[model samples]
Target: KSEVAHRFKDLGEENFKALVLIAFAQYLQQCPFEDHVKLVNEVTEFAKTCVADESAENCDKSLHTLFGDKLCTVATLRETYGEMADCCAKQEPERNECFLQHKDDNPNLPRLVRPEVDVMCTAFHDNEETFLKKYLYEIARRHPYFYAPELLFFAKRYKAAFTECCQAADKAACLLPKLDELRDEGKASSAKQRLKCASLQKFGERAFKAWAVARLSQRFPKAEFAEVSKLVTDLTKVHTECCHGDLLECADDRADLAKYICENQDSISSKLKECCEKPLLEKSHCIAEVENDEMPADLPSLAADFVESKDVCKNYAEAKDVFLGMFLYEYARRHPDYSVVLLLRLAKTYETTLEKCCAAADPHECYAKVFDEFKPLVEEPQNLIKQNCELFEQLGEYKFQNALLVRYTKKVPQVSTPTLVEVSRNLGKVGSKCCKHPEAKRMPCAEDYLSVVLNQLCVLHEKTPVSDRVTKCCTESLVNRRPCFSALEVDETYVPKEFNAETFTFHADICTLSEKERQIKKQTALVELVKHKPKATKEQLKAVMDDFAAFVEKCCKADDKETCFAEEGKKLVAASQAALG
Candidate 1:
């Protein structure tokens, strides 16, 4: 054995085919069956010499012929037998007979059959009953050659089986008319082995009708009493004859059969809709109706007319009515104001009649129109004040107080109106309060308030008359009951009592006066002379000062130098000086 293995192993250069032929030949000698041994030996010997000296010409010729002619033929025969048993158990007797006859002619082929072929044949045959009924019925209906001799055999057989199982006169009766219709059409003839074709056609019709009737009767008891009774009557008459083998020739009335099928189909559909679908639709419609009825009467009809109409309306109408009714009810509940309610009703009416026309109006314009219509009702100041006291009262005070002051001060150019003074004082108070407020004290020091006040004073300065601007600003604090300086002084040198007494001038230049000198001069004779005295009334002082200044201005213009120290100038200055005392 080892030497044999070694010789084959070193067979080299020629590769594995050479080794396999040698090994198979050795194995073939050990076989007990002479026929098997002969077959293997023949293959191995041919393989060896055919490939001798490494040439393929003889090898291809021998191997191709051997496998194709001998091996292929054996495999085909085995496969055919297996298919035959499968067709037989499936009741495809025609296919079965064809294969059985072929098998008999090739007896030697079975001896060559592999174990796999037998197992496959047995497995298919075991399930033949199910396979043939399913596949053969399809083939008969579609191909027609699977069951050649008796084309309608499977159809008839299936009908018998169904009848046996159903065992009901009504059910069997339901299937008979379709069968008889098919038979009367001359489809029962086996001419050219077309019986299967005819039977398949007939079977389909009868099966559908019987199935429909069976299901209908089970699901809906009243189907028997309904229009379906006529169908049942026709079925019973035809089914009885079909079972007895009374193959009635079918008439050329496919239209009638088709009509019967259609009617049965319609009946089934109608029964399903009525028994299963109708109540659901009705319930939905009922809910819609109730909702529609609840809608506001004041508004336009939200429920479409079709919802109320009976002739053509169905569940859609009810659903629409319910939706519209609920919507209208909610709208009315939310908008109870009389004007709003009225407008809403009008709007609803317009929506239905003038849908496009109403939409053409810009929505903002529509709102503006409504606002214009209601503007007068709330625009009166008095009414606004009554309604909202705090806001209107503040507005009224600002207006009335300012208006009166502005009118009163129209003739007085130098004096500011009380309104201006009030505003300034109020601004000052606000500034003080802001700076003094505990929360704001750290943020804004006293300088901040002073800066703000100074800015406000600067603004007031622009509006005030130049002559009274400073005086008014200084006196404003006093006028408004605030504390400030009283006696403002000027230098004696610029505001002299006796300098150039004869050449005295009016409107003296006081800018040249030092602050200290101005105060000292006010304390001396000139101060006593010009001091506002309690003895002299304000009008008396004004007359004396005006006369003296006018006289001196006339003398300076006239070059009347002697009149200054003489009686005329002396008399005028003395009178002005005594008035101050």
Candidate 2:
């Protein structure tokens, strides 16, 4: 299996062109129609970070070249899938209805992934209903998330077992067991034989509970719905207590069949109403409040800083991630003393920042204005972290202190340096004292690093006395005790205050001092042309400038930079700064 992973990675390294094409197909096959264009574009960009010779324009031919004719038959089904996805996805079940019509309109599918084409996409597509059922059972077991409810519904249309189950005396009751029989005793002699026969397990599932419930919600809309916190356990427990056949191995099958005739959704809704004499109107809402909890909290997640900043960052839409990157890099550069700690605290927050910035209204304009204001500060590098390694040493990184303490505990009494021996002795003596609540690894010292941050707040009041707001905030005792992270993050917002423990503050400046405001307002317009028009000759710039000449002339005629450059020739100076790397 590891070799298979290596083989896949090897294919990507050998030709990212082929790899991303496969990636596109797999992603397209998995995601909903609304995501096709975005997924296609994202995968292409992700591939570009590696090395792909293919251009986005030739993605189809590139796939053909890589997989030969095996994919075209599968590709044949998608020939019009593109047209349908583009037209149908903006609305609701239109995509679903279009998809159903799509199968009717183009019944031809390539022989590879099509379940009816082969028993399990690796074995023979035998002419038996039992084989098909067994094959999909393997799919549900192996890749639960990938086996969407629509897929199982599609399978039911063609698989003959549905007819057999429907023909039984107790039609609704028999469907689940009949499917279960094919899974266990009847499909192949042993489950091992079936496992070896299957091959599509490489594609993994993401949200089994959400995906599973989504189908049920569609299948029985009126039935009272209560989310099962644990689908595998709750459903299996219910099946074990109530149903008679081999339902232990059946979750998707029960979900698929019950949608039409079975009893779980309606069965339980009535039972809950009967069990407790709660308001019938309130039962549905009440059940969900208790039963259907949010997803588990222990799962991995990104930092919070990224989320709080990025939505407003949508104003910087085109370069939101770039804007976010600027935030982290600049924050770290400024707060060198506590860079590691601050980063650790805000680590999971940035994923959302990169995701939402492009959602802004006229994102190009929003981000362009943002870039004009921010990119200069971002491009300038800082050397604070490089210069202050000792400050970090004094505070002690979590991993760094853990390593030192672990080795010292092993040695009992040790160290070549006086700082280590002294620090170790101090820590060892504290463990023997009262109130053993604080863990040594989390904080080796309490009053040790607190004063550095406090002293700076008083200093900041004198440093930026131009504004009383800045001075007053710095002097506020409540704000001063903590280090001035805001001071560092501001670039110019360099005075850190503690009055309210807010994000960093910057030194306020006068726009009137150097006519600085007027120059920038006038300079903003022309900077965009410089960044994009890398090869444009002087005459080309002049030609473009001539297009805006009237606007420029109007601005030049005004009283000064602030009023003249108010709306029109607002930013030509930064554009002039955009010449090279």
Model 2 TM-score (2 dp): 0.16
Cα lDDT of candidate 1 equals: 0.33
Candidate 1 lDDT score at position 138:
31
Model 1, stretches more than 4 Å misplaced? 1-528, 532-535, 565-567, 577-581
Tens-digit lDDT track for model 1 on 366-440? 322332332343233223223333332343433332222222222222333333344433333333334334431
TM-score of each: 0.14, 0.16
- Count of backbone clashes, every candidate in sequence: 15, 26
Candidate 2 whole-model C-alpha lDDT, 0 to 1: 0.33
- The global C-alpha lDDT for each of the candidates, from Candidate 1 onward, is 0.33, 0.33
Tally clashing residue pairs in candidate 1: 15
